[PDB]
Design a protein around this ligand. Structure first.
Ligand SMILES: CCCCCCCCCCCC(=O)O
Ligand SMILES: CCCCCCCCCCCC(=O)O
Ligand SMILES: CCCCCCCCCCCC(=O)O
Ligand SMILES: CCCCCCCCCCCC(=O)O
Ligand SMILES: CCCCCCCCCCCC(=O)O
Ligand SMILES: CCCCCCCCCCCC(=O)O
Lengths: 167, 167, 167, 167, 167, 167
């Protein structure tokens, strides 16, 4: 690993958009960062779906939901301790103002094996080769890789984000 | 096209899992079917996210949410008028009992261009080469293709479903 | 890891060429796959050499023998669940017809430290950057990397395969 | 060349470990030797694989198998006529007691072009710069170079042996 | 890992420049090597600073000191068992004559989180893409990556070495 | 420049941690200061390494060692004449009690060209945009820039310090 924990209450701030909806599923997380890469791990629980009755399983909607929360979370301390080069110039204040409106999934790719236990599961996340793209929109493009597990069970994805304001 | 409409109140039954959560986004839909293929079109609106505060845009979570609703919906009249061969033996009664627990996204692939207007948008859906797979689980595998639009804007995906009970 | 197990009796089918000769040495295996990569782990035992009297150690012939069995095995479920892109179009039926005649070692590179216990040992295998080469022969070229251990002990190799029919 | 033949029945003694398994493939051989080098040539045939069903081709396992037999064979008369300096002190009696347990492949490197006819083929072998290494094990290290042919067809390798007892 | 241990007394020889100054801090180490890469792990203790009174913590000077010792150490057995290609032609005798004068840090990059316990800590080291550069000086350039830990605590660096004589 | 000299015997007090170890290398220094910046110049000599036998050159360990001494030294008169705003409230008495335990290198970045003559060399140092950071630790963060020269020869670095007590 080589990863430090992230303070709850940085998390709780970052994920308040979901918590004020009872949709925070990330219990705690640990990160590590460089000039151009972040690695994070998180532990999750799903009490109830906000959107459908009750599947009694994991869903694909919740994979995404958990990826968002972890990515959101993993980039917080990086930005704060100013470890991401391309993002120096953002305070954490900047980051939390640009969460909802300014950070987008461009393309994504999911795979599903043994259905995850929505109750106790975990994820590992790695975003790499971050690079800024100027034009008709100027965005930081963020290639990500995530993997879930828990009872066996696994899922994964390669998702590319766009983050809209920067630097 | 070559597609018939689907009665609301078949829809309303099928999508009640989302409606009882205020998360039905499919306004109406039209389908067409064969031995082994379904084509559907739908019109959507998103009043508010159930899960996050307010993005003011479309999300990836909602792409999936809309795909589910349309697929769910498109297969309803097919099963009822017994047009899907591999599914003859299901009443619509069977179908609605197997919605939540028995129908799953195996793998999926999303693409996003001009952000969709979450207020008034539409989708076109095509599932093809349905085929049953017996083994440690016996499922109908369902290769799907969907495309959204509205103001320009587009998104799309190739998602493979597993449906768990049948025939 | 992030790897699922492989059913014996898929194995037993795939490795029957060796078993009908009492030369199956792979006890069980676990794999993981992508568009263009496979990772597998296996556990081995050698009862007796088929070819020489008795060395009382591991040999280089048996390194190869074990690599073959694991590679053979690791690609089976990938092909079956159609996870390898370049190989979609093969059923598992195709695969088992092309095992003996159509899958070849082009070049290889071995290293040997602490002699492996031929009785209880294990391997880790990773094939990557698979790519098809058309010409006077049309083959899928398969760059592989394997490592053995057990009592300490280690061996390894970088072997390139050619698989002759496809796609 | 500049090479003398090797008596069958020296061969037959040396390769009995394989013959008692029906795995002797070296038909006859010729050698030449110096203080510190051996050159050998051999002619081979493979009736059937001992280990797999039937490939109908050459394999990599059999390349090694043939290298072993030829190396084993080429060093026999050298040791007997006491031509290898570092090995004087071994009778041929010593040599045949240390075959199985005491002679090992450290590292190896194979290349494969036109598939060899397993029925009628030949090899040329050259081991050079033999040198003894004392330590936690005391071995004679033996850098070797071999090349096969037959119908065209070629294969080759640079293999390093360790021989464990000496002098 | 996949790494063998390194004999103390190879270490003790290699690190004598520091030991004769009471500044050897590497207790033991394990390595693994290829044509062009070395991986090593080590365990350290710092009894007292040689240079300053007493900080009661880890320092940056000691990070470097430990990196040197581990790199010095990790390359020893590689060179001896002649596993590094570009360095074949050096005996270990060559290596120990070129330690002090001929091996240099060109550029380096350090990061520090939770202060390391100078008493019991460890490191992981990986040097890769070694390549020789001829000119006004002819050096082997050696891109390295190291990471420390122990009580939590972490530090890391990307340091590039120049080694001056070779091959 | 625009810099005043610093009295030896302020130096000698500040650097006693190194001198009592025969590791003071700063001969004399000159500084200049503002509300939030210090500039210093120093002249150095290295009699012998404390830690290794004898390289006959400059090392990276000694770059750091010299940076510490100069930074340590440059901040002394600033604090004394109370010129650093964020540090007013420290006497020089405070400063010398917090040297060893309370002043740390967070991250650092070194570059090396023409090897410095360890006998007669000089440095130029500039720390800027000092700013206090409250939290789980409350530190003054100190971004620094240093450059060495002497016979040509140059080295440089951007090092960030943390100073732990203040104000
Ligand atoms: C500046 C890099 C930002 C990385 C974290 C953003 C991840 C958020 C994922 C998108 C969430 C959403 O679409 O609502
Ligand atoms: C029998 C074919 C069923 C096709 C409609 C099923 C689509 C439902 C998509 C999965 C929804 C979910 O994961 O909650
Ligand atoms: C299509 C990729 C096939 C990968 C598995 C083939 C590995 C078999 C190794 C060669 C065995 C032999 O030479 O008999
Ligand atoms: C003393 C030199 C011995 C040279 C002949 C030994 C070659 C045998 C090759 C290894 C065979 C094996 O691993 O079973
Ligand atoms: C030939 C590659 C040598 C790798 C080991 C050298 C590492 C030594 C680091 C430099 C030590 C010093 O500057 O005193
Ligand atoms: C209050 C600012 C203090 C600036 C001088 C501190 C520089 C000391 C550098 C760190 C020395 C060490 O790690 O031992």
């Amino acid at each position: 690993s080589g990863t430090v924990p992230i303070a709850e209450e940085l998390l709780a701030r970052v994920l308040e958009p979901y918590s004020c909806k009872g949709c925070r599923y990330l219990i705690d997380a640990q990160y590590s960062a460089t000039e151009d890469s972040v690695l994070a791990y998180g532990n999750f629980t799903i009490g109830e779906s906000a959107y459908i009755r009750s599947t009694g399983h994991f869903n694909a909607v919740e994979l995404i939901l958990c990826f968002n929360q972890l990515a959101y979370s993993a980039f917080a301390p990086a930005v704060l301790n100013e470890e991401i080069r391309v993002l120096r110039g953002w305070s954490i204040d900047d980051y939390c103002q640009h969460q909802l409106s300014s950070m987008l999934i461009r393309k994504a790719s999911s795979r599903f094996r043994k259905p995850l236990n929505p109750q106790k599961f975990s994820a590992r996340l790695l975003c790499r080769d971050l690079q800024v793209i100027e034009r008709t929109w100027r965005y930081l493009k963020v290639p990500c890789v995530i993997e879930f597990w828990d009872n066996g069970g696994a899922a994964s994805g390669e998702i590319e984000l766009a983050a809209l304001n920067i630097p």
